[PDB]
Design a protein around this nucleic acid. Structure first.
Lengths: 49, 303
DNA sequence: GCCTGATTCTGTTTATTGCCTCAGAGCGGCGCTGACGCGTTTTCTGATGGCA
DNA sequence: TGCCATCAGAAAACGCGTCAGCGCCGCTCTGAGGCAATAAACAGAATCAGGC
């Protein structure tokens, strides 16, 4: 339901479930949480460092 | 919570705080709905964060946690249990043992109908896969009735369906393996079955019930101790109004009990109203049950 | 080039199936004992009514 | 369907009396248990697409 106001994604849970468990499972299995690898390499006086 | 199981198999648990304790002679309110041909089999009271061991009709053992059971209301009938456990075509659950944790070297005491006993170490059941494990080499139509946890030295009591009670030291029974039958515990007569198993732990009182809503309360110390594989004594006068014995449980003071008939009608009441009498005496009414109804459940509620 | 999720091996662990024992469990006969029938107390458990 | 009299009728202890099942001897034998072989699962590596 994203519009000009901003992002909006709606997920509806079943009547016999708990939202927190579903949210934790989505965190664990989907790309709602990702990893970023930092590696600072740049040229100094024409040499990698 | 309180857990109910149907004959075909429909598990359901609801909070205990919903029900309220009435007086002694109460009709009681309904608990769940029953199909055109069905009847509840057993009742259970346990906490949500507890392991339960389920014993099948062919000797298998399965493990589960309480909160994994479906949650429903009084109007609902529950869901089939075959989804939760990989049962066979006609295999049915007949006993549940709540275990808080596994520790030490305590033993599991299991007794079936026709007077057979068997002792195994709890360490064997620390981990179970999805498939079960054989626990008893059941023969013919024999079925499990009750299980419990016991220490090295304790006492065991067995109740029949005609008011016969046997009490003996558990040192006679020797620890055996998983794939064993067992020895004979009580010498039954003709057309009699074992209905309950109670391990006395400290001072208290013994409460018994019949199928027509009658019961009493006697002291523990009056029961004698003899050798195993022997006939017992008269636990309660069956007479005609009382009917057959349905079960018994050790309840101390300041506690409450719950009873359930074939079709719902759950009732909760205190224990101070029940008087104290001798062993060979018929008791007072506990449920004003209607015709064509039989009490088939009995549990203890602490505080 | 780097990080992750998904699929495919590979060694380990566990439940189940036969064979043959002996040692512990069960059966038969005997003395003797506890546990179950007897009336009077008694309190106590149902029935009845004020309805609430 | 739940709180108070108010009952009568009768369930239930208790000091005797006996015989019906206990313990205790003998003996006999069938089932746990040790031992070995199979066959599944379980869990950990190892490899392979995919996206910047």
């Amino acid at each position: 339901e994203s519009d000009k106001d901003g992002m909006r994604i709606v997920i509806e849970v079943k009547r016999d479930a708990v939202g927190e468990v579903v949210l934790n499972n989505l965190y664990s299995q989907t790309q709602l949480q990702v990893s970023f690898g930092i590696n600072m390499v740049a040229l100094h006086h024409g040499q990698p460092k | 919570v309180v857990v109910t199981l149907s004959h075909q198999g429909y598990v359901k648990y609801q909070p205990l705080s919903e029900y309220e304790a009435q007086r002694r002679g109460g009709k009681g309110k309904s608990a769940a709905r029953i199909k055109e041909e069905d009847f509840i089999d057993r009742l259970l009271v346990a906490n949500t964060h507890d392991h339960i061991l389920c014993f099948s009709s062919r000797g298998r053992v399965y493990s589960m946690k309480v909160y994994q059971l479906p949650e429903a209301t009084r109007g609902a009938r529950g869901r089939p249990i075959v989804n939760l456990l990989p049962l066979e075509q006609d295999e049915r659950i007949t006993a549940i043992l709540p275990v808080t944790e596994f520790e030490e070297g305590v033993k599991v005491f299991m007794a079936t109908a026709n007077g057979t006993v068997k002792k195994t170490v709890l360490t064997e059941f620390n981990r179970l896969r999805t498939a079960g494990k054989v626990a008893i080499k059941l023969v013919d139509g024999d079925e499990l009735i009750g299980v419990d946890l016991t220490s090295g030295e304790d006492e065991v009591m067995l109740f029949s369906a005609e008011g016969k009670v046997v009490r003996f030291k558990e040192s006679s029974v020797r620890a055996m393996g998983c794939n064993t039958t067992g020895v004979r515990g009580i010498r039954l007569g003709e057309g009699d079955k074992v209905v309950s198993l109670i391990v006395p732990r400290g001072d208290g009182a013994i409460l018994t019930a019949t199928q027509n809503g009658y019961g009493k309360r006697t002291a523990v110390a009056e029961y004698p101790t003899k050798s195993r594989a022997t006939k017992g004594v008269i636990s309660i006068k069956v007479t005609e109004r009382n009917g057959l014995v349905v079960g018994a449980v050790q309840v101390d003071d300041c506690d409450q009990i719950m009873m359930i008939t074939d079709a719902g009608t759950l009732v909760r009441t205190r224990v101070s109203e029940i008087s104290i009498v001798g062993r060979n005496t018929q008791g007072v009414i506990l449920i004003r049950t209607a015709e064509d109804e039989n009490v088939v459940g009995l549990q203890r509620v602490a505080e």
